[PDB]
């Protein structure tokens, strides 16, 4: 397994550049030069790089400074051929954002936040990005009376719809991807799961260019099944981008390497990205992006190790996932279990409610006890999947 | 605090009639006669009663049997004056439903399930119910390859839209309320939280008469904030019914008395039901329904005790919640914290994206460090809330 | 694969005999005859079978039925060669144990529960069981004031010390093993984790013959590291038995097949049982017992499928865990990371606290900043275990 | 309210001095001078202050700065009367402790960590602290093969037994108290709960002077009952100190004010510290320490607000918990439910295991079905605690 740019593996600057500072300690690694991030990742097999405005350009940078930094970064990009498919904004690190950007209680903060996003849409568009991700990490509260909850959503809506109107007006080839997280840094974050993100989008004036950016560890922090959540996002055609990593349980955001958390769940996500749905349906085509953090115990040899571990893990899972579905035994098991019968509509062509209620065979004389005897054999289909995952098959 | 029918407290037959059978043991109480459930609840202060088709009418009941049971129940209702505001279907107890009703892999089961719902819509409508609740408790899986996930949602949609077309066609004054649960009895249940329910509704052909039935312990089983979740349901105008109870943590569905779980969260839910949003917004008006189970350690004196504890808890919380918002000190704290500033739109009337980006004051010359100095004083507003909850104020 | 009697795969009667009644439904399978259970198990390659008193002998059986049932049971054991390595008592299904057995608030139920155990101790000895397990499933509460928490631990101590004392008194060659569970069926169960169980054994009079029976799923219900918890049980020399199964997350006790829950943790669990510790130390040499339940969606073909899969999964994992430790690149990765170095004592032979008093070479003249650059390379080390697990290396 | 020095409210320097840097952001508050910290605390009514070595004396400070800093510190203590009841060491912020202190894989870092502790023991004695706390925050791993799990417990034992042995050697009037935490900053921390900590102390050489320092939030991060866990610590006679705070759910360590997390559990926690056990037994008589952190959204007015609220909340709860136990209806509800009956021994004075051997009056002729009808009335009993807590009774 060796990644090629054809694989479409993307990494954030903040991922391999994460310096190690956590809540109980200081950084354990020196800052990463962006030029070096670009060059290193291009030699590993990366397709592209992604960043937050302040990963690159300091908050306080003068114009001369900004210009140099950008000339350095664009240079690096030209030299290596790396694409910039997604750009995001930092609305969580400066003290000004302690109560949120878009949903701050303070109105002047709300406007600075939105100003900071619009300017960043411009940059994103100069960089050639197709996706604009929003992670509202400071939107929310520790306490239940701190917010007017209906007003928190109107403020959110105002922000996101102003950003979208501006894309439409400028003619930029950008789509917005919202990224859910249930908690941390706030005790409760607004629009905590894929479900809440998808709902909110339907109340937006310009929701057609607004979709999701689910992260594997984020949905697992609320104990949900990542594979089910992206399946609903795909089903509604709102899966615009995806962040892969690992999480080992309901706790702080670990941001481990993809496959370093729940393995079987990783296998099944790769099967859904690569094979689509058993009966047909939309398929995901964008970047396979890694929003992870190299453990702080490791030095720089560890950082490029981890980066490479992400693309390896994925490729290994993919090989198993493709062998899994190509196995005849696995296809037989699938049929037995009624994985293909689920895809047939319940009603017959032009049969209505009334006609169904009246079909005697379907209700009044249905032999419920007899139908209850089917052996779905779900245990056996899961066993076959694990056996292909362990490559013992 | 004494409940009156004006309070709109509703109870399910299955709640006070829960016999005690759990996964590790048999029933500890004798079955409850429905006539007696009706009469008892009317003397406690209940407004109405609710049930599942098989709580009342056995699965296997002959027509003579069904007719008697219904004559007994309707009698009881006439005598006491109890209303039947919601009716639901049991698609989880018979063995036939082991893989789901609507999303079973087996197609004949899917049709029986839907047949069983349509017939039940008829009954619901004869009983005078305004709400038809669906709890898809067996829809989902233990294993990730057991389902074609896109096909699971199409099947769900087919069922729910056939039920809704039939209401519209019959002219019945019914609305469908979906009820989320993340897990149990299945390892993962489809449409696990309020978020996922609200999303799904937007893909329905007839989603205008389809809304939610959130349960306090269900959202807490995924660790979310119940108060935030119903605030998004209210904001989208999709809060059709609500199930109140208590849950003490992420574990099995406890179904404790309302207030017997997370107290502060209960206080804040009552504040949202009773006071609405601080800046104005939709308000909830339906039944205040209790879907709880009297602990199995208690005998029948315990059952009516628990029933009464539900309405008491709520009334006590309500008195505190109304005193809380009426306190001048609390209103001052609210202003200070910017609870009312959140309600002012970010942009000025007819100010666009472009005009905002260009306002110098809003971005280029915004003094971020200075704005970061505001003391939101959220700790102090939470302290005042707790002090009103403990009635020490 | 191919399990053989020397593998020491023991299975309980309640596992394959689990008919499928959960909280929201009735059994989906017909009762399993015990003689049938013995023959099928033996033919799959099991070494032994375990049971709860009431699993074999009805709570109501007369003396005449006890001996008839035992007759056929002993004959089957005889005809097949299964051993009976562990026995346990049912102190949770009958409504009389609704507040517990040993810690029941009612004294006459405490006596009845203790009496039931004493007699089950005589049957255990009779069968040749080396271990007598205690799962206190109903010891706990839903409410914090339901119990005197000190007296609940005094009544638990009394029961376990009376039973232990009776084993010593009759000279049975039996050990007691407590089985922790954090909740379900009680809201909170006493001695909820391995730690708590371990701590508790140290306050008994007859502690010497009391140890633990940790279960994968149950520590995973508190979000804990199952391998870390068994390590501590083993390190303490209290790992008397083990229950293997699968759990996906903090939720109800799933009791899935071993390997169908957290797969990487199962990998490392098998590594500790089979290889023990990297530097040398204690080893677990008792039986590998499966405490699981066949999914209720599947017929009897799933039941025997599910029992074979337990066994397969443990041997596939065993295989990959033997190749992993044997691999010279892993052994070297291990050396780089300091695994063997953790094995050296901190203090030099003869060094005192004053001597070291941090020595400086160890304190004053120590270069903290230089020691901090060490790359532990834990990420690379984790990547080698996963490729070994995926069958890749 | 009105806290006074006899209340024994102790606060750490890092709590009110917590500037607000979390994982996604920088500090939102200016550094708090220690002399200032002492004066403000004393004027609020605190009895004492606790600190980590590096909280007061920089990791780099020279000998000359240590003594200057200690000079002013002792003077402030002097001028105000605060005592210094507990001292602890920082073994987690400096990058050198990235794999731990005592269980670091690197031997030279194990020595450096132990040396740091030994010297901090001499400062503790000097200050008059009675307790020396140990929070092993970096002892653990992200990955299961990063450690030899047996050697990690041997290296932890070595460190605590060397430190204890040195206390005994110098004749300091000091006790060691371990502080459990299940995770964060490590993915898995060793001795993650009260049980584990308790079990671990029993394998030490110098166990007699080692006990625990449980923290509300930290057992709540594993979903456990904090009152149940302190009960067991107390019952074991190992409850040497206590850390009080608030946590809403399984997520990152929130460190909220005591009472702003699980309010009913806080109620019952205060009932156990203040009233002890219903039937009589051990009592906790040390200090009431607050290990919390003022929300980062709030300025310095919130910091002193948040410190007063800890104290208020504990006295409001204390008040309601004294009225609850004193209430004659509660005392009678208690009798009905069997709380006093749990206090009686199971066996009669002189009864042997053979004698009882279940006696029958206790086994054979026992009417299990009749004993099962007992109404324990735990629901009514819970309803009386909540109305006592809501200020209603
Ligand atoms: Zn992400
Ligand atoms: Zn993340
Ligand atoms: Zn409900
Ligand atoms: Zn429920
Ligand atoms: Zn279990
Ligand atoms: Zn078990
Ligand atoms: Zn903490
Ligand atoms: Zn603490």
Q: List chain A domain ranges.
A: 1-393
Catalytic residue among C7, C22, C39, C52: C52
CA–CA dist D114, D111 (Å, integer): 5
Omega within 30 of 0 (cis) for the link into D331: no
* Nearest-by-Cβ selection for A25 from D92, D256, D296: D92
Residue C359: closest CA among chain D residues belongs to which residue?
Answer: D115
Nearest to D28 by CA among A104, B375, B339: B375
Smallest CA–CA separation between D254 and chain A, in Å? 7
Omega within 30 of 0 (cis) for the link into C185: yes
Using the Cβ of B143 and the Cβ atoms of chain C, whether some distance falls under 8 Å is answered with yes
Strand-pair partners of B134: B178
Number of other residues whose CB lies within 10 A of the CB of residue B118: 20
Nearest to C173 by CA among C87, C74, C255: C87
Under a CB-based contact definition with an 8 Å cutoff, are residues A310 and A8 in contact?
no
Residues in chain C: 393
CA–CA dist C154, B310 (Å, integer): 34
CA–CA dist D215, D181 (Å, integer): 8
Number of other residues whose CB lies within 10 A of the CB of residue C264: 23
Q: How was this structure determined?
A: X-ray
Backbone φ/ψ region at A45: left (φ over 0), alpha (ψ -120 to 50), beta: left
Catalytic residue among B22, B33, B39, B55: B55
CA–CA dist C197, C230 (Å, integer): 12
CA-CA distances (angstroms) from residue A8 to A11, A177, A260, A304, B381? Answer: 10, 18, 20, 18, 49
3-state secondary structure of C64: helix
Under a CB-based contact definition with an 8 Å cutoff, are residues A210 and A204 in contact?
yes
Q: Do B260 and D374 touch (CB under 8 A)?
A: no
CA–CA dist A244, A258 (Å, integer): 6
Residue C188: closest CA among chain B residues belongs to which residue?
Answer: B248
Under a CB-based contact definition with an 8 Å cutoff, are residues C117 and C167 in contact?
no
Which residues in chain B touch residue C185, judged by CB atoms under 8 angstroms apart?
22-25, 252
Smallest CA–CA separation between A69 and chain B, in Å? 19
Print the SS3 string covering chain B: CCCCHHHCEEEEHHHHCCCCCECCECCCCCCCCHHHHHHHHHHHCCCEEEEEHHHHCCCCCCHHHHHHHHHHHHHHHHHHCCECCEEECCCCCCHHHCCCCCCCCCHHHHHHHHHHHHHHHHHHHHCCCCEEEECCCCCEECCCCCCCHHHHHHHHHHHHHHHHHHHHHHCCCCEEEECCCCCCCCCEECCCCHHHHHHHHCCCCCHHHEEECCEHHHHHCCCCCHHHHHHHHHHCCCECCCEECECCCCCCCCCECCCCCCHHHHHHHHHHHHHCCCCCCCCCCCCEEECCCCCCCCCHHHHHHHHHHHHHHHHHHHHHHHHHHHCHHHHHHHHHCCCCHHHCCCCCCCCCHHHHHHCCCCCCCCCHHHHCCCCCCHHHHHHHHHHHHCCCC
For residue A129, give every residue at least 6 positions away whose Cβ sits within 8 Å of its Cβ, in sequence order, or none.
A50, A84, A85, A86, A87, A174
CA–CA dist A2, C67 (Å, integer): 67
Q: Do D297 and A142 touch (CB under 8 A)?
A: yes
Under a CB-based contact definition with an 8 Å cutoff, are residues B197 and B239 in contact?
no
Residues having C-beta closer than 5 Å to ion ligand 4: B 217, 253, 255
CA–CA dist D104, D87 (Å, integer): 22
* Nearest-by-Cβ selection for A92 from D24, D137, D256: D24
Smallest CA–CA separation between C340 and chain D, in Å? 8
For residue D318, give every residue at least 6 positions away whose Cβ sits within 8 Å of its Cβ, in sequence order, or none.
D270, D274
* Nearest-by-Cβ selection for C251 from B27, B184, B260: B184
CA–CA dist C231, C209 (Å, integer): 19
Which residues in chain B touch residue C184, judged by CB atoms under 8 angstroms apart?
23-24, 251-252
CATH architecture of A1-393: Alpha-Beta Barrel (3.20)
Chains that touch B (3 or more CB pairs under 8 A): A, C, D
Q: Do C145 and D271 touch (CB under 8 A)?
A: yes
Chains that touch D (3 or more CB pairs under 8 A): A, B, C
3-state secondary structure of D285: coil
Which A residues, 265 through 294, put their C-beta within 8 Å of a C-beta on chain B?
265, 268, 271-272, 277-279, 281-282
For residue C349, give every residue at least 6 positions away whose Cβ sits within 8 Å of its Cβ, in sequence order, or none.
none
Using the Cβ of D52 and the Cβ atoms of chain A, whether some distance falls under 8 Å is answered with no
Smallest CA–CA separation between D185 and chain A, in Å? 7
Separation of CA C11 from chain center: 12
Q: Do B23 and C221 touch (CB under 8 A)?
A: no
Smallest CA–CA separation between B93 and chain C, in Å? 4
CA–CA dist A249, A253 (Å, integer): 9
Antiparallel, parallel or unpaired: β D131-134 and D188-189? unpaired
Exposure string of C355-388, with b = 16+ CB inside 10 Å and e = fewer, is ebbbbeebbeebeeeebbebbbbbbbbbbbbbbb
Residues in chain D: 393
Nearest to C24 by CA among B198, A355, B321, B100: B100
Which residues in chain B touch residue D391, judged by CB atoms under 8 angstroms apart?
390-392
Nearest to D140 by CA among D194, D103, D177, D166: D103
The end-to-end CA distance of chain C, in Å, is 19
3-state secondary structure of D28: coil
C-alpha Rg value of chain A to the nearest Å: 23
- Find the A136 Cα to ligand 7 centroid distance in Å: 25
Q: Do A313 and C392 touch (CB under 8 A)?
A: no
Secondary structure letter of residue D343 according to DSSP? G
Using the Cβ of A369 and the Cβ atoms of chain B, whether some distance falls under 8 Å is answered with yes
For residue A295, give every residue at least 6 positions away whose Cβ sits within 8 Å of its Cβ, in sequence order, or none.
A256, A302, A306, C378, C379, D142
Using the Cβ of D137 and the Cβ atoms of chain A, whether some distance falls under 8 Å is answered with yes
C-alpha Rg value of chain C to the nearest Å: 23
Reported in sequence order, the residue ranges of chain D that DSSP labels E, i.e. its strands, are 9-12, 48-52, 86-88, 131-134, 140-141, 175-178, 188-189, 210-212, 243-244, 288-290
Residues having C-beta closer than 5 Å to ion ligand 8: D 215, 243, 291
- Resolution, in Å, please? 2.5
Smallest CA–CA separation between A222 and chain D, in Å? 9
Q: Do D23 and A20 touch (CB under 8 A)?
A: no
Q: To the nearest 5 percent, what fractions of chain C are helix, strand and coil? A: 45, 10, 40
CA–CA dist B314, D383 (Å, integer): 12
CA–CA dist A233, B150 (Å, integer): 10
CA–CA dist B234, B219 (Å, integer): 15
Residue A261: closest CA among chain C residues belongs to which residue?
Answer: C264
Cβ-defined contacts of D233-237 (< 8 Å, 24+): D233/D194, D233/D198, D234/C150, D234/D272, D234/D281, D234/D282, D234/D283, D234/D284, D235/C149, D235/C150, D235/C153, D235/C154, D235/C203, D235/D281, D235/D282, D236/C199, D236/C203, D236/D198, D237/D282
For residue C262, give every residue at least 6 positions away whose Cβ sits within 8 Å of its Cβ, in sequence order, or none.
A262, C220, C226, C246, C247, C248
Q: Do B20 and C95 touch (CB under 8 A)?
A: yes
CA–CA dist A103, B341 (Å, integer): 11
Exposure string of A265-298, with b = 16+ CB inside 10 Å and e = fewer, is bbbbbbbbbbebbbbebeebebbbbbbbbbbbbb
Number of other residues whose CB lies within 10 A of the CB of residue B383: 23
Under a CB-based contact definition with an 8 Å cutoff, are residues B192 and B234 in contact?
no
Nearest to A77 by CA among A57, A240, A69, A121: A69
- Find the D291 Cα to ligand 7 centroid distance in Å: 7
Catalytic residue among A7, A53, A55, A271: A55
The three-point CA angle A52-A53-A59 to 5° equals: 125
- Find the D132 Cα to ligand 8 centroid distance in Å: 13
Backbone φ/ψ region at A56: left (φ over 0), alpha (ψ -120 to 50), beta: alpha
Antiparallel, parallel or unpaired: β C188-189 and C140-141? antiparallel
CA-CA distances (angstroms) from residue C224 to A261, C263, D58, D215? Answer: 14, 15, 35, 17
Q: Do B342 and A152 touch (CB under 8 A)?
A: yes
Under a CB-based contact definition with an 8 Å cutoff, are residues D153 and C235 in contact?
yes
Q: Do A142 and D256 touch (CB under 8 A)?
A: yes
3-state secondary structure of C163: helix
CA–CA dist C1, B369 (Å, integer): 65
Strand-pair partners of A133: A88, A177
CA–CA dist D103, C23 (Å, integer): 44
Using the Cβ of A195 and the Cβ atoms of chain B, whether some distance falls under 8 Å is answered with yes
CA-CA distances (angstroms) from residue A359 to A345, A355, A363, B329, D148? Answer: 16, 6, 7, 66, 66
Using the Cβ of D302 and the Cβ atoms of chain A, whether some distance falls under 8 Å is answered with no
Binding residues of D: 179, 215, 218, 243, 253, 255, 291
Print the SS3 string covering chain A: CCCCHHHCEEEEHHHHCCCCCECCECCCCCCCCHHHHHHHHHHHCCCEEEEEHHHHCCCCCCHHHHHHHHHHHHHHHHHHCCECCEEECCCCCCHHHCCCCCCCCCHHHHHHHHHHHHHHHHHHHHCCCCEEEECCCCCEECCCCCCCHHHHHHHHHHHHHHHHHHHHHHCCCCEEEECCCCCCCCCEECCCCHHHHHHHHCCCCCHHHEEECCEHHHHHCCCCCHHHHHHHHHHCCCECCCEECECCCCCCCCCECCCCCCHHHHHHHHHHHHHCCCCCCCCCCCCEEECCCCCCCCCHHHHHHHHHHHHHHHHHHHHHHHHHHHCHHHHHHHHHCCCCHHHCCCCCCCCCHHHHHHCCCCCCCCCHHHHCCCCCCHHHHHHHHHHHHCCCC
Strand-pair partners of C10: C48, C289
Mind giving me the DSSP string for D29-59? SPPPPHHHHHHHHHHHT-SEEEEEHHHHS-S
Residues in chain B: 393
For residue C362, give every residue at least 6 positions away whose Cβ sits within 8 Å of its Cβ, in sequence order, or none.
C356, D108, D111, D112, D114, D115
Nearest to D161 by CA among D149, D182, D186, D178: D178
Using the Cβ of A379 and the Cβ atoms of chain C, whether some distance falls under 8 Å is answered with yes
Under a CB-based contact definition with an 8 Å cutoff, are residues A132 and A177 in contact?
yes
The three-point CA angle A85-A90-A96 to 5° equals: 165
Binding residues of B: 179, 215, 218, 243, 253, 255, 291
Q: Do B149 and A272 touch (CB under 8 A)?
A: yes
Residue D384: closest CA among chain C residues belongs to which residue?
Answer: C145
Using the Cβ of A374 and the Cβ atoms of chain C, whether some distance falls under 8 Å is answered with yes
3-state secondary structure of D239: strand
Q: Do A94 and B272 touch (CB under 8 A)?
A: no
């Amino acid at each position: 397994v060796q990644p090629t740019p054809a694989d479409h593996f993307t990494f954030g600057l903040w991922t391999v550049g994460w310096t190690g500072a956590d809540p109980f300690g200081v950084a354990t690694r020196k800052n990463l030069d962006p030029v070096e991030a670009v060059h290193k990742l291009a030699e590993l097999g990366a397709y592209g790089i992604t960043f937050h405005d302040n990963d690159l350009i300091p908050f306080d940078a003068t114009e001369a400074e900004r210009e140099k930094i950008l000339g350095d970064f664009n240079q690096a990009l030209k030299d290596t051929g790396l694409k910039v498919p997604m750009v995001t904004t930092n609305l969580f690190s400066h003290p000004v954002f302690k109560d949120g950007g878009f949903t701050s209680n303070d109105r002047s903060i709300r406007r600075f936040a939105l100003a900071k996003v619009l300017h960043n849409i411009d940059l994103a568009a100069e960089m050639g990005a197709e996706t604009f991700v929003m992670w509202g990490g400071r939107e929310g509260s520790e306490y239940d009376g701190s917010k007017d909850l209906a007003a928190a959503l109107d403020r959110m809506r105002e922000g996101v719809d102003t950003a979208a109107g501006y894309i439409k007006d400028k003619g930029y080839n950008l789509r917005i991807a919202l990224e859910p997280k249930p908690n941390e840094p706030r005790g409760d974050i607004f629009l905590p799961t894929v479900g809440h993100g998808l709902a909110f989008i339907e109340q937006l004036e310009h929701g057609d260019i607004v979709g999701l950016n689910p992260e594997t560890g984020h949905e697992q922090m609320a104990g949900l099944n990542f594979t089910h959540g992206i399946a609903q996002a795909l089903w509604a055609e709102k899966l615009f981008h995806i962040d892969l990593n690992g999480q080992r349980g309901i706790k702080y955001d670990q941001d481990l390497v993809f496959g370093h958390g729940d393995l079987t769940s990783a296998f099944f996500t790769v099967d859904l990205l690569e094979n689509g749905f058993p009966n047909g349906g939309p398929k995901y085509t964008g970047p396979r992006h890694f929003d992870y953090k190299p453990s702080r115990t490791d030095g720089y040899d560890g950082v490029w190790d981890s980066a490479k571990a992400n693309m390896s893990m994925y490729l290994l899972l993919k090989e198993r996932a493709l062998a899994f579905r190509a196995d005849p035994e696995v296809q037989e098991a699938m049929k037995t279990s009624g994985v293909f019968e689920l895809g047939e509509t319940t009603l017959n062509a032009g049969e209505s409610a009334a006609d169904l209620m009246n079909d005697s065979a379907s209700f009044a004389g249905f032999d419920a006890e007899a139908a209850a005897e089917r052996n779905f054999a779900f245990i056996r289909l899961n066993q076959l999947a694990i056996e292909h995952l362990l490559g013992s098959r």
